[PDB]
Amino acid sequence: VDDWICEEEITGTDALLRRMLLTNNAKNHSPKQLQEAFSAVPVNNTQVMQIIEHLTLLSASELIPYAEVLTSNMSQLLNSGVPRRILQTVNKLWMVLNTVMPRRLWVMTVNALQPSIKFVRQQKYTQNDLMIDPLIVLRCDQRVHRCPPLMDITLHMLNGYLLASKAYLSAHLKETEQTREELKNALLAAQDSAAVQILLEICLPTEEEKADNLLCNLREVQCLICCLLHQMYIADPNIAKLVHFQGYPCELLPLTVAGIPSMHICLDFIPELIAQPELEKQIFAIQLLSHLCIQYALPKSLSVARLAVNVMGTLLTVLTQAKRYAFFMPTLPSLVSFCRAFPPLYEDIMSLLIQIGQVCASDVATQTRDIDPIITRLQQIKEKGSMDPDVQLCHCIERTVIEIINMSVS
């Protein structure tokens, strides 16, 4: 639909501008001239501004000869100082070309956006190769991941090839027929889940840039990826269920909950996810419900929050000490959000916190300790590496009740 609704008319400004500016008959603009503008070793951005700003006035039928010069020079557009207007205009022209030649254009753009370490790095990517493995379109130059106008293009190609692989697999299944439907459906679901997981890993603030979260390229890339994931979750909520059963890093959880409006359906399978045998699934379910209760304060959200509190209270008495540490260190900050969303949960959360703290003080008393937190029972409010896990868990309990009291007082 995104490749079709762009053809819908708005106000007649484009036909007017075409009629008033394309009649200048300055026919110097050509794929050869634009290629010479790109291929200048002392590259000038002004000339390519002039050419592609003229190109925006062209119709989609007459923008066909510029497809090769527009695609094959996209590697130069990532070269650390290309102006944002060049990238936006190239994205606009690619979106225009997507309406008349998308099957060729996706192949040319995938071949253009390779890392190109080798001489070709498999420039022979055909349409069949991309329909077989749609995740090829995520093996780009890796500088595109902070280039939002090229994230728009690569997300368009990713969504297109993910849609095309379903038809390709159905065609191959019917051709080789001369069960396998279940295996095809499992392959498709795992393929979409893998695409979502790779997209979420693109959203992560990688450690090269870690050492202003709103006015960065990462924010725009996160918004584009969140829009694509919203569309894909609407198209198939089972993909969202499969992805959240697989799980992603919890740093992405506030971003996914805030940026994807179709994340409220995760409350349907969070009761199912919290019953999973693996501890990581329960940790991720509690951490996901933590942000979902802040985003959506539903009565059913309160019911699932009560369920999660009961699950944590039961896992306090089921898990061993190492498992108690590994489970309660990530899930303790979720109780602050549970108390923020649901003030009726204060009694249950505080009784649970008393139980966890009194359990965790006992095995502190069991072994000799390097810092002995039992003596430090009279400590003031502290300011917001090789320590013992039990003492770390005790300090986590104290920190979580500090945040709960600070939140409820305010």
């Binding site: 609407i234 969202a240 409220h264 359906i265 959506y296």
Partner: peptide, 13 residues
Amino acid sequence: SPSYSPTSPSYSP
């Protein structure tokens, strides 16, 4: 439904 917010107005036929 994933296409509608939980706080969105309900549709009554």
